[PDB]
Design a protein around this ligand. Structure first.
Ligand SMILES: Nc1ncnc2c1ncn2[C@@H]1O[C@H](COP(=O)(O)OP(=O)(O)OP(=O)(O)O)[C@@H](O)[C@H]1O
Lengths: 8, 276
């Protein structure tokens, strides 16, 4: 899921 | 720095959806509590929801207002997508409608005002909710609302909704718009004071008939200013609902007489009226 990761 | 499952201690299961698990979790470094919504990657790919999931991530990441569930973070591993959500300790509003039957005028005014404030923010950011209903209005520990469920939201169709709260323009044009949330708000207000939503029938189809016809009744005990306001929301022409863009938006809706005693600036800081 490529650039899913996120904060915040 | 991107979070990881091992950064957390998972506790009780808060709930389950069709393709999800939501568990209460404590971040070990901070002791903060989160409701973490966990998604099986496999299931999401077997139903072509990879955009759909990203849209929900994107939409919620633009919501920094005290009446919406905050997205604090997302992360993944081999099998799961993880969504860090603010924790709404007291559950769905629907539960309190069922528990106490219907709201007195003070509790109605208060929770309606918060939803109005919520929708003013959401529509101010050009987002339609499209599935607003008491199931999707959570309550945090202080009994303030926390609107959630953004998978079906629209950023400025498709065929989404729940039968009892769907607006006529959906079943006639397949084109929702900001004003379609005001219809649902009309149904929610009616449900608060009456105890039941206004368009009721045996099955989805007959409910749909009543909406296009505007076939519904007010019970005798309905608060007069609440009924007046509902009548200005349950309007077939979506350019004529109070609060919509064609009527200059939320100013005129917030100024309706039902909200006369409301202070819009610190609603979220006021202690909500007790629900009895
Ligand atoms: N932030 C939260 N705080 C407390 N409870 C929550 C939170 N988010 C979800 N829940 C609970 O978890 C349950 C499932 O939520 P989820 O969004 O995963 O599925 P759903 O929206 O109920 O159904 P579906 O996934 O089919 O749309 C719901 O009953 C909801 O009340």
């Amino acid at each position: 899921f490529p650039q899913f990761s996120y904060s915040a | 720095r991107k979070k990881r499952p091992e950064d957390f201690k998972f506790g009780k299961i808060l709930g389950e959806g069709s393709f999800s698990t939501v568990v209460l979790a404590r971040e070990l470094a901070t002791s903060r509590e989160y409701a973490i919504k966990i998604l099986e990657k496999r299931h999401i790919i077997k139903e072509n929801k990879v955009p759909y999931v990203t849209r929900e991530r994107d939409v919620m990441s633009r919501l920094d207002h005290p009446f919406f569930v905050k997205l604090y973070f997302t992360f993944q591993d081999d099998e799961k997508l993880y969504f860090g959500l603010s924790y709404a300790k007291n559950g769905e509003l629907l539960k309190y409608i069922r528990k106490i039957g219907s709201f007195d005028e003070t509790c109605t005014r208060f929770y309606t005002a918060e939803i109005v404030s919520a929708l003013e923010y959401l529509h101010g950011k050009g987002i339609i909710h499209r599935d607003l209903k008491p199931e999707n209005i959570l309550l945090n520990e202080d009994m303030h609302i926390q609107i959630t469920d953004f998978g079906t939201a629209k950023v400025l169709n498709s065929f989404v909704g729940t039968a009892q709260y769907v607006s006529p323009e959906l079943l006639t044009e397949k084109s929702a718009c900001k004003s379609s949330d005001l219809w649902a708000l009309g149904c929610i207000i009616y449900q608060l004071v009456a105890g039941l939503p206004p368009f009721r029938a045996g099955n989805e189809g007959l409910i749909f008939a009543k909406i296009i016809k505007l076939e519904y009744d007010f019970p005798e005990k309905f608060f007069p200013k609440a009924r007046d306001l509902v009548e200005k929301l349950l309007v077939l022409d979506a350019t004529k609902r109070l609060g919509c863009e064609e009527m200059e938006g939320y100013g005129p809706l917030k100024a309706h007489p039902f909200f006369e005693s409301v202070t819009w600036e610190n609603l979220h800081q006021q202690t909500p009226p007790k629900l009895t």
